[PDB]
Amino acid sequence: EYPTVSEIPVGEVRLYQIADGVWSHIATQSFDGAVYPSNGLIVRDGDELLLIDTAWGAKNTAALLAEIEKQIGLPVTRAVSTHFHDDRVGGVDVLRAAGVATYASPSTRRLAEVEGNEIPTHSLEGLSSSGDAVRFGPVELFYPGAAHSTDNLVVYVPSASVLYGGCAIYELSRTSAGNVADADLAEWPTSIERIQQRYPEAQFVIPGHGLPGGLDLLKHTTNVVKAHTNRSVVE
Ligand code: NA
Ligand SMILES: [Zn+2]
Ligand SMILES: [Zn+2]
Ligand SMILES: [Zn+2]
């Protein structure tokens, strides 16, 4: 029942409840002449909500806020962007105008500024070096090292065993490398292994784009990334 790319008109946002107090948000965007889906996370935070990632642009993010109020009815009070690309920070200004406190690591904030992308307000401490983890409300933020980008964070919800990999993790249907312009292809498998070693208890794994699955999304991603490094597509 997870919504697929052809099931979400561009400009609309769907929510999917993964576990008690955990939802993903799903939006779509035109990119490279195709239409791509994109996931973020919503985590219940007492009587408030913690948002992970925007919905890829101002229009989608406004629709995300409206859909959250329609379906959940609790206020989004904080948001964390997991890397500097537009599918993660595009819409930060909308969140800020809606009273959401926006956060990213210093590295993400700097890279967003260099790229010309929206810059989250707050700087997350303690995520500078590969292997660093910090608790942030009801989630753990983890910097596994460079992968899809040098700044990419992953997010674990310990109460629900939900691992949100962001764009460092590919859905199973993705057979080839996606947007790797800013990626560290050489470190990506090592970074995935750090994720596997830290969260072997994860029951649900949410990629940055596409269908959730289990922990075999990690090995699938390593396989695809390694094939790309070797100028190969297998699947
Ligand atoms: Na709180
Ligand atoms: Zn990206
Ligand atoms: Zn992405
Ligand atoms: Zn595979």
What distinguishing features does this structure have?
6 helices; alpha/beta; BlaB//VIM/IMP-1; seven-stranded mixed sheet; metal-binding; five-stranded mixed sheet; binds zinc ion; 25% helix; 12 strands; 235 residues; beta-lactamase activity; binds sodium ion
Task: Give the topology, please.
Blueprint: E1 14-19, E2 22-31, E3 34-45, E4 48-52, H1 58-71, E5 76-80, H2 86-89, H3 92-97, E6 101-104, H4 106-115, E7 122-123, E8 133-136, E9 139-142, E10 154-157, E11 162-166, H5 188-198, E12 204-207, H6 216-229
Parallel strand pairs: 4-5, 5-6, 6-7, 11-12
Antiparallel strand pairs: 1-2, 2-3, 3-4, 8-9, 9-10, 10-11
The structure holds sodium ion and zinc ion (3 copies).
Tell me the span between the first and last alpha carbons. 24 Å
List ligands, each type once. sodium ion, zinc ion
Overall geometry: globular
By secondary-structure content and strand pairing, the structural class works out as alpha/beta
Order of H and E elements: EEEEHEHHEHEEEEEHEH
Cα radius of gyration in angstroms: 16 Å
Tally of strands: 12
Range of helix content? 25-40%
As laid out across the biggest beta sheet, the strand order is 1-2-3-4-5-6-7
How many domains is the backbone divided into?
1
Biggest beta sheet attributes: 7 strands, mixed
Number of helices: 6
Quote the beta fraction.
25-35%
Keywords: Antibiotic resistance, Hydrolase, Metal-binding, Periplasm, Signal, Zinc
Catalytic activity: a beta-lactam + H2O = a substituted beta-amino acid
Binding site for Zn(2+) 4: 220, 235
Subunit structure: Monomer.
